[PDB]
């Protein structure tokens with residue numbers, strides 16, 4: 622089974638999922654010199670209801686804050702999107718050390734971590750499962766985290782880490798102000814890509830914010846104390862869970878800003 626360890630890591634993924642070498646894989650390196658502004662891009666419209674969050678858990682590959690997507694209370698619209706995309710989950714990627722943990726990298730630079738807000742096209746498809754199999758089915762908002770002062774908006778999440786240390790563990794997580802976690806500026810880059818974890822489906826319209834948010838070194842270290850293994854099973858820490866940048870393959874990276 623896949624993972625981020627030496628024997629089941631990203632370089633080995635093509636062995637289980639041939640699509641790992643697809644033409645629209647994520648993440649990628651964003652080279653600002655090659656980015657083209659597109660006036661046809663609309664401003665992002667983000668409406669998040671704090672009552673949407675339901676639970677947080679350890680999937681074995683990251684922590685997952687799952688939201689109730691039966692309702693249309695939390696949705697993402699605008700940007701490069703056509704229609705409304707319902708909020709589904711929030712998770713985080715990091716590396717074994719502060720100097721290299723983000724999935725997407727900018728001009729050869731890796732941030733310390735990267736937050737992903739996963740949405741699906743509820744306007745066209747019946748469920749996230751089916752949307753995940755369509756080119757225009759998913760939209761993932763990426764937020765870079767860079768080392769800085771402690772971020773009090775992460776406390777709610779970090780306080781639960783011990784209760785979901787083991788893979789499979791979960792605890793109730795509600796009344797979460799996701800919006801306040803985003804940077805003040807929503808300027809972003811967008812390109813067609815895929816999920817960064819198996820099944821690596823190429824159904825994602827990526828929206829990566831340019832402005833990063835802060836996290837202290839102490840805070841980030843807590844996520845590395847999570848295990849990618851289950852209780853009663855041989856232990857292994859989830860010290861790193863980011864996929865290396867993938868070949869752009871001629872895709873166009875667009876900027877919503879000048």
Ligand SMILES: CC(=O)Nc1nnc(S(N)(=O)=O)s1
Pocket residue numbers: 710737739761815816817818819
């Ligand atoms: C259930 C679900 O959301 N699966 C995902 N797989 N990859 C994702 S990511 N890292 O590309 O946002 S989300």
Ligand SMILES: [Zn+2]
Pocket residue numbers: 712713714737817
């Ligand atoms: Zn992710």
